Design a binder for this molecule. Structure first.
Ligand SMILES: CC(C)Cc1ccc([C@H](C)C(=O)O)cc1
Ligand SMILES: CC(C)Cc1ccc([C@H](C)C(=O)O)cc1
Length: 578
């Protein structure tokens, strides 16, 4: 029995949690009650297997079991139409079908949070259902959230309430902690979406290069054969979490943490604090540990990689291991480099060895490869310096606005909502990275852009409208940012023709938060630019200025939200004039 294997390892709590998250990520539209019901039924079954390891179907794989359970409500096409088909499938195909139907943008209603007085009551009255409800809302809206990690957020979420609801000012104690969690949750979800995308679209070889490079930066004192071992397990974990095998993902992740702690002295010195605390807190700790200090006397890479004469010979022998070694060596002494840059260099090396080793005199051909790295390191450096200077002048809001015009000009086909989301996030990278010293500025920025640009790529993959987006998303993972940076403005785009409804602002806007307000303007600026691509960064302002005048006035005037209808047609006339 497999269900039995996992149950024993994870226990009742975690087991139940993980299964709920899995079900939530599968049928995102299904209601809470139904998921709970299925989890229990499933958890009951599990219990019998622990005792009689062959009872009913205890001999099955989690796929068949999980699959059949969900298919007891999936067949209801009137609710989940396209799903029924999936249930008509079998074992492998049935599971792939489900994985294929996960929505990265579920049409679920926003998730507002009741007053502090209600949450605390609900929490205190029934603490279990409360927490379960949380896992459910998150899991269904983030179908790729790193499962083991969501259990850690669940614990911290519980501690927030467990303490604040006993305060003097609950609102003052809770709200902050919730905000900090809401964010970190999105960040966490984003990073994980990139990892799954990597494995799923580009293959495991790329996820490995990534793992080698980043682990090598954190553990410089570790030996290549040690890292490689770590890279192998780490890869197995995420492959599992990203395919939906959550229970085993949770298991393997635990084992890895165990190992890493035992062989502490062989790996890192800063692992001291991580191995002294609870499991969930230990895993989270390790995964977020600071790089160990760089080993004193280290020979130059040139020795074994560009000057030696056996280069091509060793390559041919075991190319992946040789490249793996190159990366490990280059990374361990370059934490001032972002993971994607390291992989870009590694790829420049591979391409050169491939060309150079088939020549009449290799050593002469591949002798100046490091000359080819100079541009690659410098390009990101200049880009960050220029954009951070701008960010430091305009501020976040205006800087996001600048990026909005820029992106809408590059990929006008893309849906207004998607562009607003991606442009806002891109702008948030300046608040995050620009404040650092040059030493930590590029790794921060470039690796973060890799997360944001992936968001666009997946959202776009749903309903493709721009071949320039498709191209820059599919041609090379590591080069996405460069590809997008090269795009200027789409010369083939044919301007949109005004639509009354799109530029009509209603009074229902005078009730929204300051945020949803600027987001309204931002959605207009985008619509504007789609109508007048050729327009310039000069004029737009003038109009955008006017846009504000409309809401302030029309909102503050006691005229029945009618100015909205009449003055709505007014602004349209001025614009067209410019
Ligand atoms: C990291 C951030 C602060 C600066 C930043 C943001 C987006 C871009 C892309 C390539 C663009 O401008 O299209 C470059 C630099
Ligand atoms: C293993 C490494 C040395 C070479 C390597 C690394 C990443 C990629 C991905 C798909 C890319 O090009 O974005 C290809 C080849």
């Amino acid at each position: 029995s497999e269900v039995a294997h996992r149950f024993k390892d994870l226990g009742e709590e975690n087991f139940k949690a993980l299964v709920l998250i899995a079900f939530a990520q599968y049928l995102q539209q299904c209601p809470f009650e139904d998921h709970v019901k299925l989890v229990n039924e499933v958890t009951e079954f599990a219990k019998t297997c622990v005792a009689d390891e062959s009872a009913e179907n205890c001999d099955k794989s989690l796929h068949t079991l999980f699959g059949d359970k969900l298919c007891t409500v999936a067949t209801l096409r009137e609710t989940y139409g396209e799903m029924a088909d999936c249930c008509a499938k079998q074992e492998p195909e049935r599971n792939e079908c489900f994985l294929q139907h996960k929505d990265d943008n579920p049409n679920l209603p926003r998730l507002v949070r009741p007053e502090v007085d209600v949450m605390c009551t609900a929490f205190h009255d029934n603490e279990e259902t409360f927490l379960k409800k949380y896992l459910y809302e998150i899991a269904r809206r983030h179908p790729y959230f790193y499962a083991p990690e969501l259990l850690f957020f669940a614990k911290r979420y519980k501690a927030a309430f467990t303490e604040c609801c006993q305060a003097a000012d609950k609102a003052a104690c809770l709200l902050p902690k919730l905000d900090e969690l809401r964010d970190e949750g999105k960040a966490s979800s984003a990073k994980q979406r990139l990892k799954c995308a990597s494995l799923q679209k580009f293959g495991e070889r790329a996820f490995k290069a990534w793992a080698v490079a980043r682990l090598s930066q954190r553990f410089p004192k570790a030996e290549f054969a040690e890292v490689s071992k770590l890279v192998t397990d780490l890869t197995k974990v995420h492959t599992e979490c990203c395919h939906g095998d959550l229970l085993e993902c949770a298991d393997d992740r635990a084992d890895l943490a165990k190992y890493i702690c035992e062989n502490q002295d062989s790996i890192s010195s800063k692992l001291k604090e991580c191995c002294e605390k609870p499991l969930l807190e230990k895993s989270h700790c390790i995964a977020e540990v600071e790089n160990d200090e760089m080993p004193a006397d280290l020979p130059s890479l040139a020795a074994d990689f560009v000057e030696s004469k056996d280069v091509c010979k060793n390559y041919a022998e075991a190319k992946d291991v040789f490249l793996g070694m190159f990366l490990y060596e280059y990374a361990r002494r370059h934490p001032d480099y972002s993971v994607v840059l390291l992989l870009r260099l590694a790829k420049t090396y591979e391409t050169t060895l491939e060309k150079c080793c088939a020549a009449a005199d290799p050593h002469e051909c591949y002798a100046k490869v490091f000359d080819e790295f100079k541009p690659l390191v410098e390009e990101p450096q200049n880009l960050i310096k220029q954009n951070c200077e701008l960010f430091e002048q305009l501020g976040e809001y205006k800087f996001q606005n600048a990026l909005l015009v820029r992106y809408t000009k590059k990929v006008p086909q893309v849906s207004t909502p998607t562009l607003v989301e991606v442009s806002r996030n891109l702008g948030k990278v300046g608040s995050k990275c620009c404040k650092h010293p040059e030493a930590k500025r590029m790794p921060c920025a470039e690796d973060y852009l890799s997360v944001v640009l992936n968001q666009l790529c997946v959202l776009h993959e749903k309903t493709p409208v721009s071949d320039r987006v498709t191209k820059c998303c599919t041609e090379s993972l590591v080069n996405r940012r460069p590809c997008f940076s090269a795009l200027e403005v789409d010369e083939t785009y044919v301007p949109k023709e005004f639509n009354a409804e799109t530029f009509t602002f209603h009074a229902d806007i005078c009730t929204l938060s300051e945020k949803e307000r600027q987001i309204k303007k931002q959605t207009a600026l985008v619509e504007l630019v789609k109508h007048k691509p050729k327009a310039t960064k000069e004029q737009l302002k003038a109009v955008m200025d006017d846009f504000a005048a409309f809401v302030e006035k029309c909102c503050k005037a006691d005229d029945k939200e009618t100015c909205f209808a009449e003055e709505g047609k007014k602004l349209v006339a001025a614009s067209q004039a410019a």
